[PDB]
Scaffold this motif. Structure first.
Motif, PDB file in Angstrom:
ATOM      1  N   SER A  73      -1.664  35.304 -12.939  1.00 44.69           N
ATOM      2  CA  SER A  73      -1.873  34.369 -14.038  1.00 44.69           C
ATOM      3  C   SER A  73      -3.189  33.617 -13.891  1.00 44.69           C
ATOM      4  O   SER A  73      -3.757  33.173 -14.896  1.00 44.69           O
ATOM      5  CB  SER A  73      -0.706  33.390 -14.130  1.00 44.69           C
ATOM      6  OG  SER A  73      -0.664  32.559 -12.993  1.00 44.69           O
ATOM      7  N   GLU A  74      -3.711  33.489 -12.670  1.00 42.12           N
ATOM      8  CA  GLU A  74      -4.951  32.749 -12.486  1.00 42.12           C
ATOM      9  C   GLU A  74      -6.172  33.510 -12.977  1.00 42.12           C
ATOM     10  O   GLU A  74      -7.178  32.880 -13.288  1.00 42.12           O
ATOM     11  CB  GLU A  74      -5.118  32.367 -11.014  1.00 42.12           C
ATOM     12  CG  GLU A  74      -5.190  33.555 -10.072  1.00 42.12           C
ATOM     13  CD  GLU A  74      -3.828  33.965  -9.535  1.00 42.12           C
ATOM     14  OE1 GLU A  74      -2.813  33.340  -9.928  1.00 42.12           O
ATOM     15  OE2 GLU A  74      -3.779  34.919  -8.715  1.00 42.12           O
ATOM     16  N   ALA A  75      -6.115  34.834 -13.070  1.00 41.51           N
ATOM     17  CA  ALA A  75      -7.292  35.588 -13.488  1.00 41.51           C
ATOM     18  C   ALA A  75      -7.572  35.418 -14.977  1.00 41.51           C
ATOM     19  O   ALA A  75      -6.656  35.292 -15.795  1.00 41.51           O
ATOM     20  CB  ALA A  75      -7.116  37.074 -13.180  1.00 41.51           C
ATOM     21  N   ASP A  76      -8.854  35.435 -15.329  1.00 44.07           N
ATOM     22  CA  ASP A  76      -9.281  35.347 -16.721  1.00 44.07           C
ATOM     23  C   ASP A  76      -9.960  36.649 -17.159  1.00 44.07           C
ATOM     24  O   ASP A  76      -9.965  37.646 -16.428  1.00 44.07           O
ATOM     25  CB  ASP A  76     -10.155  34.103 -16.932  1.00 44.07           C
ATOM     26  CG  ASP A  76     -11.437  34.115 -16.128  1.00 44.07           C
ATOM     27  OD1 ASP A  76     -11.912  35.184 -15.682  1.00 44.07           O
ATOM     28  OD2 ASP A  76     -12.000  33.011 -15.958  1.00 44.07           O
ATOM     29  N   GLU A  77     -10.504  36.656 -18.385  1.00 45.11           N
ATOM     30  CA  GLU A  77     -11.037  37.899 -18.944  1.00 45.11           C
ATOM     31  C   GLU A  77     -12.221  38.422 -18.145  1.00 45.11           C
ATOM     32  O   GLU A  77     -12.462  39.638 -18.112  1.00 45.11           O
ATOM     33  CB  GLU A  77     -11.476  37.704 -20.392  1.00 45.11           C
ATOM     34  CG  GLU A  77     -11.798  39.022 -21.086  1.00 45.11           C
ATOM     35  CD  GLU A  77     -13.293  39.383 -21.100  1.00 45.11           C
ATOM     36  OE1 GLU A  77     -13.655  40.462 -21.628  1.00 45.11           O
ATOM     37  OE2 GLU A  77     -14.111  38.607 -20.565  1.00 45.11           O
ATOM     38  N   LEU A  78     -13.001  37.525 -17.539  1.00 46.70           N
ATOM     39  CA  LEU A  78     -14.131  37.977 -16.740  1.00 46.70           C
ATOM     40  C   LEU A  78     -13.642  38.680 -15.482  1.00 46.70           C
ATOM     41  O   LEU A  78     -14.218  39.695 -15.068  1.00 46.70           O
ATOM     42  CB  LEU A  78     -15.034  36.796 -16.383  1.00 46.70           C
ATOM     43  CG  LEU A  78     -16.143  37.032 -15.350  1.00 46.70           C
ATOM     44  CD1 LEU A  78     -17.187  38.016 -15.872  1.00 46.70           C
ATOM     45  CD2 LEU A  78     -16.796  35.710 -14.930  1.00 46.70           C
ATOM     46  N   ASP A  79     -12.581  38.146 -14.859  1.00 44.67           N
ATOM     47  CA  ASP A  79     -11.952  38.841 -13.738  1.00 44.67           C
ATOM     48  C   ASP A  79     -11.505  40.232 -14.152  1.00 44.67           C
ATOM     49  O   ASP A  79     -11.667  41.200 -13.396  1.00 44.67           O
ATOM     50  CB  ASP A  79     -10.739  38.063 -13.231  1.00 44.67           C
ATOM     51  CG  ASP A  79     -11.113  36.740 -12.593  1.00 44.67           C
ATOM     52  OD1 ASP A  79     -12.063  36.697 -11.766  1.00 44.67           O
ATOM     53  OD2 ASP A  79     -10.450  35.737 -12.930  1.00 44.67           O
ATOM     54  N   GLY A  80     -10.929  40.342 -15.351  1.00 39.02           N
ATOM     55  CA  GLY A  80     -10.473  41.630 -15.842  1.00 39.02           C
ATOM     56  C   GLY A  80     -11.605  42.606 -16.093  1.00 39.02           C
ATOM     57  O   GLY A  80     -11.477  43.796 -15.801  1.00 39.02           O
ATOM     58  N   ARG A  81     -12.732  42.123 -16.632  1.00 40.13           N
ATOM     59  CA  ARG A  81     -13.861  43.020 -16.875  1.00 40.13           C
ATOM     60  C   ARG A  81     -14.486  43.496 -15.569  1.00 40.13           C
ATOM     61  O   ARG A  81     -14.805  44.688 -15.419  1.00 40.13           O
ATOM     62  CB  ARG A  81     -14.907  42.337 -17.756  1.00 40.13           C
ATOM     63  CG  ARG A  81     -16.206  43.121 -17.832  1.00 40.13           C
ATOM     64  CD  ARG A  81     -17.200  42.536 -18.816  1.00 40.13           C
ATOM     65  NE  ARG A  81     -18.397  43.369 -18.839  1.00 40.13           N
ATOM     66  CZ  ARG A  81     -18.513  44.493 -19.534  1.00 40.13           C
ATOM     67  NH1 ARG A  81     -17.522  44.949 -20.285  1.00 40.13           N
ATOM     68  NH2 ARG A  81     -19.643  45.192 -19.454  1.00 40.13           N
ATOM     69  N   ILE A  82     -14.653  42.582 -14.607  1.00 43.70           N
ATOM     70  CA  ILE A  82     -15.141  42.966 -13.282  1.00 43.70           C
ATOM     71  C   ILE A  82     -14.212  43.990 -12.642  1.00 43.70           C
ATOM     72  O   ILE A  82     -14.662  44.985 -12.057  1.00 43.70           O
ATOM     73  CB  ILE A  82     -15.291  41.725 -12.386  1.00 43.70           C
ATOM     74  CG1 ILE A  82     -16.379  40.797 -12.928  1.00 43.70           C
ATOM     75  CG2 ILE A  82     -15.589  42.142 -10.935  1.00 43.70           C
ATOM     76  CD1 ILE A  82     -16.391  39.432 -12.268  1.00 43.70           C
ATOM     77  N   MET A  83     -12.901  43.739 -12.696  1.00 44.39           N
ATOM     78  CA  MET A  83     -11.961  44.674 -12.091  1.00 44.39           C
ATOM     79  C   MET A  83     -12.014  46.023 -12.796  1.00 44.39           C
ATOM     80  O   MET A  83     -11.850  47.068 -12.158  1.00 44.39           O
ATOM     81  CB  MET A  83     -10.548  44.099 -12.160  1.00 44.39           C
ATOM     82  CG  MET A  83      -9.428  44.917 -11.508  1.00 44.39           C
ATOM     83  SD  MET A  83      -9.751  45.401  -9.799  1.00 44.39           S
ATOM     84  CE  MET A  83      -8.988  44.038  -9.007  1.00 44.39           C
ATOM     85  N   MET A  84     -12.206  46.026 -14.118  1.00 45.48           N
ATOM     86  CA  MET A  84     -12.338  47.295 -14.829  1.00 45.48           C
ATOM     87  C   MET A  84     -13.519  48.084 -14.294  1.00 45.48           C
ATOM     88  O   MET A  84     -13.423  49.302 -14.071  1.00 45.48           O
ATOM     89  CB  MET A  84     -12.493  47.047 -16.330  1.00 45.48           C
ATOM     90  CG  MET A  84     -11.179  46.734 -17.019  1.00 45.48           C
ATOM     91  SD  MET A  84     -11.225  47.036 -18.790  1.00 45.48           S
ATOM     92  CE  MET A  84     -12.767  47.938 -18.917  1.00 45.48           C
TER      93      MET A  84
END
Length: 64
Positions: free
Chosen positions: A18-29
């Motif tokens: 829950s702490e991750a945001d969209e930028l975390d998601g794009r980096i992880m992608m």
């Protein structure tokens, strides 16, 4: 989760916690793409944690 061409960064972020945001998601992608990972089922817990750590390194290096 299976990553498709229509998977959103919000969904990947939700996989991270829950702490991750969209930028975390794009980096992880980006990281999953470099590692050739389509099914997140295939990642061991230690591999996944290493990717989380790396996404935090990238977030602070390449954006701060």
């Amino acid at each position: 989760m299976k990553i498709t061409n229509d998977t959103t960064t919000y969904e990947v972020a939700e996989l991270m916690g829950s702490e991750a945001d969209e930028l975390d998601g794009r980096i992880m992608m980006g990281l999953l793409s470099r590692e050739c990972v389509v099914d997140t089922d295939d990642l061991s817990e230690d591999q996944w944690l290493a990717l989380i750590d790396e996404s935090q390194k990238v977030r602070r290096e390449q954006f701060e």
